[PDB]
């Protein structure tokens, strides 16, 4: 079959390209170790997903035999544990390391890189037992040494280990290692390791709904600002979800919009869908109409269509429509992770209406407002308007003597003393950008 | 450059025949419940004529 | 195992009058059987059941803080420190009282936090959570009257030990009212007059602005 | 004391490098 | 989640609770930090018999939080509890900070050795000699 020969040729080409690339990342690691410049290791992490799957088990075994020519204890211990391949006559002699290069032991950076590559390979293989064992061995190998350069790849190593363990539903088991390793990173101040470790520690509670624990771990912990964009986006998403479930809404919405903007524009379709969905529910709960622009995006269309229906129903303020939409889409809502806040909406609907009325009018007779918001009582209207003022959604003082509902006054602080405070934040941020730019000029 | 495999990627849920949507770009107030305009003035007017 | 003997239930004003047949229950047995990780499945059987009645006791005795020293386990137990098997009170006549306490004070954080545990039967209802939950759904909007009216819908354990304790906050809250009805008082509350007993702009900020501007200048001319 | 003595060396090595390339930056624009 | 049990006034009961807690202190430190008041009060209560264990627990809590000065102080209050202890991450960090502190104090004496010497706790010297 010519198809089999073509596939074998393609696999051989991919393996050769991958060996060349692995040599390139090894050279990058050597340069970063020599010059204390982890920029190359950041590049390797950035391009790490691209090299997820281009080899085979036998190719990996031959590569490891050729590379770890040094009498490395890690390879010595790992080889017997690896399943012994069947006797094969075809064994290419791959000896890139000769003389000084061969004598020099292979760096733990390279060892971890190759190990995590095997992790990705047998991960797509879904080889959970060996994944876990290899992760544990990697954990011991990292713990033996205390070099910062290792953590650069070790962070994604932990990430992949956690992802493997999630399938096994062993989060309650991982938590111990996660907490301990976070403590160690904190005692060493490893920025990226800390970022990923905090992220996964939060993710555990999020899936297990230990929200009080999550609040503890978010408030008491400290997130360094120099973290990566992706980890920042994850942190913002999880924090936004926690706050939104926590009945605090303004900060949650602000943070969620900031994260969504920070999130990749074209990648992470599902994750972007989830973040948009949580932000949509939060906004609707906070009595603000969302942006209709999103609900037409092709990238996030069908995962939201139920939410488009929900937002239209809430705006129209039709109880029958809201009940029917819930009755039709409760299962999807549960699946998404928004049932609690939607149950909150199911009685908080009238807040959006009070906000819209108090924003469109400037003085409404209380009987008129009662007729507007279908309450059937001036007393009920008075209570509701007092509630609107209390919650801080409207800024009108109710005068229960002439049915007045007096809105705000004439020109506000936003033309008297507000613009200066507004400009101060902008100027601080711009100067900060400039200072970071100048201080990040160059090494040589 | 991250796959950002947080975990989920919605599988289109109820993927069905395309509704064809509409290339026009529409704000929120676009779809409401109403009884047209001419009929509006018609149920209007009367009395003294509106 | 001091098995039972606390079978006072019936009606001894103090669950066991003296802590002897009461607190003694655990006293130090508290330590004995395992309470930190099939095992003492019987201790598990009396889990905090050793004091479920004791938690009920506190409420059966206007002992309030207590539940706070109590939730620890009934919660751990009904939150299931470990999925066991016998849980017939907090899934029904109880927990929802924690819910009462989840606001009773006035706080909400928790009220809405734990409300994820009650997995799904919350909306599926159970006579229990339903009312403990209906209150906030029927109070957050501001429909204060939505409850007082039939607030007597208490299909569970007393709960009265806080339903009023909470119905108290409403009073103080609704009292909040364009601070600063003449003598007619609020019809949702009106005891008579015992409630009457109950009770920059013009200077441009010079120093702060000077500080901020000088900081601008400092950062502008600074480490070359 | 490899746990600690090595702990201090890294604690005062990675940081001190940042004061190495900083010296060039201050050296670079000076000549310019 | 257990401070509710810890609230009892039985000395032996509270000591039992604390020994139960110290197993999971390292993993529930997040919340436990909200329970610093009770532990600090218990340690301040000199009459308590398990003051050594209370000091150990509080030093551990502060170590997790990050206030290493407080963590070292609580270790010093603990005294001989960790002197036997030699091989562990928390003890390693504690000894790191305490040895650095002894370094600084000795340096201060060296720069100002004209009497008025700052009293170096005998526990510091004992731990330095252990190392």
A touches B (3+ CB pairs < 8 Å)? Answer: yes
> E94: nearest CA in chain D?
D4
Q: Which residues does E contribute to its contact with A (CB < 8 Å)?
A: 26-27, 29-31, 33-34, 64-66, 89, 93
DSSP state of A48: T
CB A44 within 8 A of CB A29: yes
Helix, strand or coil for residue A399?
A: strand
Q: Count Cβ neighbours within 10 Å for each residue of A226-247 and write b for 16 or more, e otherwise.
A: ebbebbbbbbbbbbbbbbbbbb
How far off is chain C from E104, nearest CA to CA, in Å?
31
Element (H, E) at A351: helix A339-360
CB A321 within 8 A of CB B33: no
What's chain D's length in residues? 32
- The span from the CA of E22 to the CA of E24, in Å, is 5
Question: H-type helices in A209-303, by residue range?
Answer: 211-220, 229-245, 250-262, 269-285
User: Is A303 within 8 Å of B10 when comparing Cβ atoms?
Assistant: yes
CB A66 within 8 A of CB A91: no
* Distances, alpha carbon C217 to alpha carbons A295, A438, C201, C220, D29, in Å: 46, 17, 27, 5, 21
CB C4 within 8 A of CB C29: no
Nearest CA among A428, A438, A434, A435 for reference residue C211:
A428
User: Is C69 within 8 Å of E16 when comparing Cβ atoms?
Assistant: no
User: Is D3 within 8 Å of E99 when comparing Cβ atoms?
Assistant: no
Helix, strand or coil for residue A78?
A: helix
Nearest CA among C41, C53, C116, C50 for reference residue C84:
C41
Question: H-type helices in chain B, by residue range?
Answer: 38-43
Nearest CA among A259, D10, A171, A163 for reference residue A155:
A163
Of chain B, the end-to-end C-alpha distance in Å amounts to 63
Indicate the residue of A274, A292, A312 with minimum beta-carbon distance to B26: A292
Indicate the residue of A269, A296, A302 with minimum beta-carbon distance to B13: A302
- The span from the CA of A61 to the CA of A165, in Å, is 24
CB C116 within 8 A of CB A209: yes
Residues 6+ apart with CB under 8 A from A251: A243
Instruction: Take residue A323 and report the two structure tokens written for it.
Output: 């009940």
For helices A269-285 and A305-316, the axis angle rounded to 10 degrees is 10
Q: Which residues does A contribute to its contact with C (CB < 8 Å)?
A: 209, 211-212, 245-247, 334, 339-340, 343-344, 346-348, 350-351, 379-380, 383-384, 386-387, 389-390, 397-398, 400, 417, 420, 424, 427, 431, 435
Residues 6+ apart with CB under 8 A from A170: none
Indicate the residue of C28, C31, C72 with minimum beta-carbon distance to E4: C72
C touches E (3+ CB pairs < 8 Å)? Answer: yes
Helix, strand or coil for residue C103?
A: helix
- The span from the CA of C175 to the CA of C121, in Å, is 35
CB C12 within 8 A of CB C20: no
For helices E89-111 and E68-78, the axis angle rounded to 10 degrees is 100
Residue bearing tokens 């002897």:
C20
DSSP string, A405-436: EE---SS-GGGTTHHHHHHHHHHHHHHHHHHH
Q: For residue C115, is it within any domain?
A: yes
Neighbours of A336 (CB within 10 A): 21
Q: For residue C224, is it within any domain?
A: no
- The span from the CA of E91 to the CA of E85, in Å, is 7
CB C185 within 8 A of CB C195: yes
- The span from the CA of C1 to the CA of C43, in Å, is 8
Residue bearing tokens 């938690």:
C55
> Residues C187, C191, C194, C195: what is their CA dihedral angle, to the nearest 10 degrees?
-30
Helix, strand or coil for residue C30?
A: coil
Helix, strand or coil for residue E46?
A: coil
Answer left, alpha or beta for residue A288, where phi above 0 means left and psi between -120 and 50 means alpha.
beta
User: Is C36 within 8 Å of E20 when comparing Cβ atoms?
Assistant: yes
Sign of CA dihedral C119, A234, A422, A288: negative
Q: Count Cβ neighbours within 10 Å for each residue of A128-164 and write b for 16 or more, e otherwise.
A: eebbbebbeebbebbeeebebbbbbbbbbbbbbbbbb
Residue D16 burial class via C-beta count within 10 angstroms: exposed 0-12, middle 13-18, buried 19 and up = exposed
How far off is chain A from D24, nearest CA to CA, in Å?
7
Of chain D, the end-to-end C-alpha distance in Å amounts to 47
Instruction: Take residue C131 and report the two structure tokens written for it.
Output: 């009312």
What's chain C's length in residues? 224
Residue E103 burial class via C-beta count within 10 angstroms: exposed 0-12, middle 13-18, buried 19 and up = exposed
Q: For residue C167, is it within any domain?
A: yes
Residues 6+ apart with CB under 8 A from A415: none
Strand partners of residue A397: A406
DSSP state of A398: E
Q: What total number of domains does chain C contain?
A: 1
Interface contact A201, partner E, CB < 8 A: no
Phi, psi for A406 (deg, rounded to 5): -80, 125
E touches A (3+ CB pairs < 8 Å)? Answer: yes
Residues of E in contact with D3 (CB under 8 A): 92, 96
Element (H, E) at A404: strand A404-406
CB A138 within 8 A of CB A117: no
How many CA atoms does the CB half-sphere of E53 hold within 13 Å? 16
Interface contact C184, partner A, CB < 8 A: no
Residues 6+ apart with CB under 8 A from E99: D4, E128, E131
Nearest CA among A202, A327, A343, A201 for reference residue C115:
A343
CB E78 within 8 A of CB E55: yes
Residues of A in contact with D15 (CB under 8 A): none
User: Is E30 within 8 Å of A187 when comparing Cβ atoms?
Assistant: no
- Chain A contact probe: residue of D13, D25, D27, D30 with most A CBs at under 10 A: D25
> E87: nearest CA in chain D?
D3
Residue bearing tokens 């509270």:
E14
> Residues A208, A209, A210, A212: what is their CA dihedral angle, to the nearest 10 degrees?
160
* Distances, alpha carbon A96 to alpha carbons A11, A23, A89, A110, C187, in Å: 21, 9, 21, 14, 90
Residues of D in contact with E92 (CB under 8 A): 3-4
Nearest CA among A78, A145, A87 for reference residue A114:
A78
Neighbours of C12 (CB within 10 A): 15
Residue A204 burial class via C-beta count within 10 angstroms: exposed 0-12, middle 13-18, buried 19 and up = buried
- The span from the CA of E73 to the CA of C59, in Å, is 42
* Distances, alpha carbon E101 to alpha carbons A206, E75, E93, E121, E127, in Å: 40, 13, 12, 11, 12
- The span from the CA of C48 to the CA of C69, in Å, is 11
> D17: nearest CA in chain A?
A36
Residue bearing tokens 């290792």:
A150
Indicate the residue of E1, E4, E16 with minimum beta-carbon distance to C69: E4
Neighbours of A342 (CB within 10 A): 23
Radius of gyration of chain C (CA): 25
* Distances, alpha carbon E113 to alpha carbons A77, E107, E108, E123, in Å: 55, 9, 8, 21
Interface contact E95, partner D, CB < 8 A: yes
How many CA atoms does the CB half-sphere of C44 hold within 13 Å? 14
* Distances, alpha carbon B36 to alpha carbons A20, A125, A318, B41, B48, in Å: 69, 61, 20, 9, 22
User: Is B14 within 8 Å of A296 when comparing Cβ atoms?
Assistant: no
Neighbours of E33 (CB within 10 A): 16
Instruction: Take residue A335 and report the two structure tokens written for it.
Output: 């699946």
Nearest CA among A39, A45, A82 for reference residue A60:
A82
Instruction: Tell me whether strands A397-399 and A404-406 are parallel, antiparallel or unpaired.
Output: antiparallel
DSSP E strands, C8-133:
none
How far off is chain A from C2, nearest CA to CA, in Å?
34
> C31: nearest CA in chain E?
E16
Q: What is the resolution of this structure in A?
A: 3.8
> A405: nearest CA in chain C?
C178
- The three-point CA angle C14-C15-C21 to 5° equals 100
Distance of CA C135 to the CA centre of its chain: 13
- The span from the CA of A284 to the CA of A216, in Å, is 27
> Residues C80, C84, C85, C89: what is their CA dihedral angle, to the nearest 10 degrees?
-30
- C108-116 — which CB contacts under 8 Å span 24+ positions? C108/A247, C108/C136, C109/A246, C109/A247, C110/A212, C111/C136, C112/A245, C112/A246, C112/A247, C112/A340, C112/A344, C112/C136, C113/A211, C113/A212, C113/A245, C113/A246, C114/C79, C115/A340, C116/A209, C116/A211, C116/A245, C116/A340
Interface contact A217, partner E, CB < 8 A: yes
- The span from the CA of A389 to the CA of A258, in Å, is 27
Strand partners of residue A399: A404
- Chain D contact probe: residue of A437, A443, A444 with most D CBs at under 10 A: A443
CB A209 within 8 A of CB A228: no
DSSP string, C168-201: HHHHHHHH-SS---TTT--TTT--TTHHHHH---
Residues of E in contact with C69 (CB under 8 A): 4-5, 7-8
What's chain A's length in residues? 444
Determine the number of helices (DSSP H) and then strands (DSSP E) in chain C: 11, 0
For helices E11-32 and E51-65, the axis angle rounded to 10 degrees is 0
Instruction: Take residue E10 and report the two structure tokens written for it.
Output: 């039985």
Radius of gyration of chain A (CA): 29
Helix, strand or coil for residue A397?
A: strand
Q: Which residues does E contribute to its contact with C (CB < 8 Å)?
A: 1-5, 7-8, 10, 12-13, 16, 20, 23-24
CB A134 within 8 A of CB A115: yes
- For chain C, give the residues followed by a break (C–N over 2.5 Å): 37, 180, 190, 199
How far off is chain C from A397, nearest CA to CA, in Å?
7
CB A240 within 8 A of CB A259: yes
DSSP state of A298: G
Partners for A (CB, 8 Å, 3+ pairs)?
B, C, D, E
- The span from the CA of C150 to the CA of E62, in Å, is 50
Nearest CA among C63, C54, C45, C55 for reference residue C25:
C54
DSSP state of B34: -
């Amino acid at each position: 079959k010519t198809a089999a020969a073509a596939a074998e040729h393609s696999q051989r080409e991919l393996d050769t390209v991958t060996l060349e690339d692995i040599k390139e990342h090894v050279k990058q690691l050597e340069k970063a170790v020599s010059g204390k410049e982890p920029r190359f290791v950041l590049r390797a992490l950035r391009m790490l997903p691209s090299t997820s799957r281009r080899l085979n088990h036998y190719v990996l075994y031959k590569a490891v035999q050729g590379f770890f020519t040094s009498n490395n204890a890690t390879r010595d211990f790992l080889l017997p544990f690896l399943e012994e391949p069947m006797d094969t006559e075809a064994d290419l002699q791959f000896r890139p390391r000769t003389g000084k290069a061969a004598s020099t032991p292979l760096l733990p950076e390279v060892e971890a890189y190759l190990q995590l590559l095997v992790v990705i390979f047998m991960m797509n293989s879904k080889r959970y037992k060996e994944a876990q064992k290899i992760s544990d061995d990697l954990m011991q190998k990292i713990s033996t040494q205390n070099r910062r350069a290792l953590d650069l790849v070790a962070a994604k190593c932990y990430y992949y280990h956690a992802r493997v363990y999630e399938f096994l539903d062993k989060l309650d088991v991982v938590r111990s290692f996660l907490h301990a390793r976070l403590r160690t990173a904190t005692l060493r101040h490893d920025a990226d390791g800390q970022a990923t470790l905090l992220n996964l520690l939060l993710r555990n509670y999020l899936h297990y709904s230990l929200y009080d624990q999550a609040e503890k771990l978010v408030s008491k912990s400290v997130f360094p600002e120099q973290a990566n964009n992706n980890e920042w986006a994850r942190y913002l998403y999880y924090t936004g979800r926690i706050k939104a479930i926590q009945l605090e809404y303004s900060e949650a919405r602000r943070t969620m919009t900031n994260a969504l903007r920070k999130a990749p524009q074209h990648t992470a379709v599902g994750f972007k869908q989830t973040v948009h969905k949580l932000l949509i529910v939060v906004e609707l709960l906070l009595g603000e109409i969302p942006d209709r622009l999103q609900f037409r995006q092709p990238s996030l269309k069908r995962s939201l269509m139920p939410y488009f229906l929900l937002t239209q129903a809430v705006r129209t303020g039709n109880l029958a429509k809201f009940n029917q939409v819930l009755d039709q889409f409760g299962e999807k809502f549960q699946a998404d992770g928004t049932y609690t806040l939607i149950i909150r909406l199911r009685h908080n609907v009238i807040k959006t209406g009070v906000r819209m009325i108090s924003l469109s009018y400037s003085r409404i007779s209380l009987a008129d407002i009662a007729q507007k918001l279908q309450l059937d009582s001036p007393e009920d209207a008075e209570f509701i308007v007092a509630k609107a003022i209390r919650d801080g959604v409207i800024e009108a003082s109710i005068n229960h003597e002439k049915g007045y509902v007096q809105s705000k006054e004439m020109i506000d602080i936003y033309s008297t003393r507000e613009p200066q405070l507004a400009f101060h934040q902008r100027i601080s941020f711009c100067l900060d950008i400039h200072n970071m730019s100048v201080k990040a000029m160059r090494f040589p | 450059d991250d796959e950002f495999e947080e975990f989920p990627a919605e599988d289109w849920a109820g993927l069905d025949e395309d509704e064809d949507a509409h290339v026009w770009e529409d704000n929120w107030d676009d779809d409401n419940v109403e009884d047209d305009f001419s009929n509006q003035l018609r149920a209007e007017l009367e009395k003294h004529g509106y | 195992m001091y098995e039972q003997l606390k079978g006072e239930w019936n009606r001894k004003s103090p669950n066991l009058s003296k802590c002897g047949e009461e607190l003694g229950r655990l006293k130090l047995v508290l330590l004995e059987l395992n309470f930190l990780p099939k095992l003492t499945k019987q201790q598990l059987i009396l889990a905090r059941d050793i004091l479920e009645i004791g938690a009920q006791w506190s409420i059966l005795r206007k002992d309030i803080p207590s539940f706070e020293r109590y939730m620890a386990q009934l919660k751990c137990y009904y939150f299931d420190y470990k999925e066991q098997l016998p849980e017939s009170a907090y899934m029904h006549q109880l927990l929802g009282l924690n819910l009462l306490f989840l606001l009773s004070q006035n706080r909400v954080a928790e009220f809405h936090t734990e409300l994820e545990r009650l997995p799904a039967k919350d909306i599926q209802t159970n006579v229990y959570i339903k009312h403990p939950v209906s209150l906030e759904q029927y109070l957050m909007e501001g429909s204060y009257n939505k409850v007082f009216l039939a607030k007597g819908n208490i299909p569970a354990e007393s709960y009265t030990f806080f339903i009023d304790i909470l119905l108290d906050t409403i009073r103080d809250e609704i009292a909040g009212c364009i601070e600063k009805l003449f003598t007619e008082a609020t019809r949702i509350l009106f005891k008579m007059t015992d409630y009457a007993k109950k009770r920059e702009d013009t200077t441009i900020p010079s120093t702060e602005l000077a500080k901020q501007v000088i900081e601008y200048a400092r950062q502008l001319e600074m480490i070359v | 004391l490899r746990q600690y003595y090595l702990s201090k060396i890294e604690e005062l090595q990675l940081i001190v490098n940042d004061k190495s390339q900083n010296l060039r930056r201050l050296q670079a624009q000076r000549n310019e | 989640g257990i401070i509710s049990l810890l609230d009892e006034d039985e000395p032996q009961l509270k000591e039992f609770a604390l020994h139960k807690l110290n197993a999971v202190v390292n993993d529930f430190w997040a919340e436990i930090s909200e329970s610093v008041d009770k532990i600090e009060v218990l340690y301040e209560d000199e009459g308590f018999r398990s003051r050594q264990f209370a000091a150990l627990v509080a030093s551990k809590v502060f170590y997790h939080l990050g206030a290493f000065e407080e963590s070292l102080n609580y270790a010093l209050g603990a005294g001989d509890l960790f002197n036997v202890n030699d091989n562990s991450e928390y003890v390693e960090t504690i000894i790191a900070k305490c040895i650095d502190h002894y370094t600084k104090q000795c340096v201060e004496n060296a720069d100002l050795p004209e009497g008025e010497k700052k009293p170096i706790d005998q526990r510091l010297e004992g731990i330095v000699n252990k190392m």
